[PDB]
Amino acid sequence: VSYPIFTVRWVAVHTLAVPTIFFLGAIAAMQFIQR
């Protein structure tokens, strides 16, 4: 079949995936903070 690319599913998936990794990257950096 000739499937499309940008779809409603694509939107949804990204609304969760994009912030997630951005957070996973943020948290990963926190592991090195100290005092």
Partner 1 sequence: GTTGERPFSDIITSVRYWVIHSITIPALFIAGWLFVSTGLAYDVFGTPRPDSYYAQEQRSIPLVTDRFEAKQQVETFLEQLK
Partner 2 sequence: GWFDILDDWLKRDRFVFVGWSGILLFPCAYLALGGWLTGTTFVTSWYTHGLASSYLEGCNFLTVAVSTPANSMGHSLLLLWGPEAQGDFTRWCQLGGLWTFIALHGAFGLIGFMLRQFEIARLVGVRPYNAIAFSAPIAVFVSVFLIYPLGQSSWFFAPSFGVAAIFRFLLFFQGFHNWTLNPFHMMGVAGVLGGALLCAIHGATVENTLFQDGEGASTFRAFNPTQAEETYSMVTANRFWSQIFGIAFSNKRWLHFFMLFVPVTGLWMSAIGVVGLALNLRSYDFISQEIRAAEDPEFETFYTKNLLLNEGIRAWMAPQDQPHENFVFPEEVLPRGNAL
Ligand X SMILES: CCCCCCCCCCCCCCCCCC(=O)OC[C@H](CO[C@@H]1O[C@H](CO)[C@H](O)[C@H](O)[C@H]1O)OC(=O)CCCCCCCCCCCCCCCCC
Q: Which of 14, 15, 17, 18 binds partner 2 (CB under 8 A)?
A: 15
The yes or no reply on residue 29 touching ligand BCR (CB under 6 A) is: no
> What count of residues does the chain have?
35
The yes or no reply on residue 19 touching ligand BCR (CB under 6 A) is: yes
Virtual torsion, Cα 18, 20, 23, 24, nearest 10 deg:
-120
Copy the structure tokens of residue 28: 């990963």
The yes or no reply on residue 25 touching partner 1 (CB under 8 A) is: yes
Q: Which of residues 1-35 bind ligand X (CB under 6 A)?
A: 12-13
Residues annotated in the binding site for heme, as ranges?
14
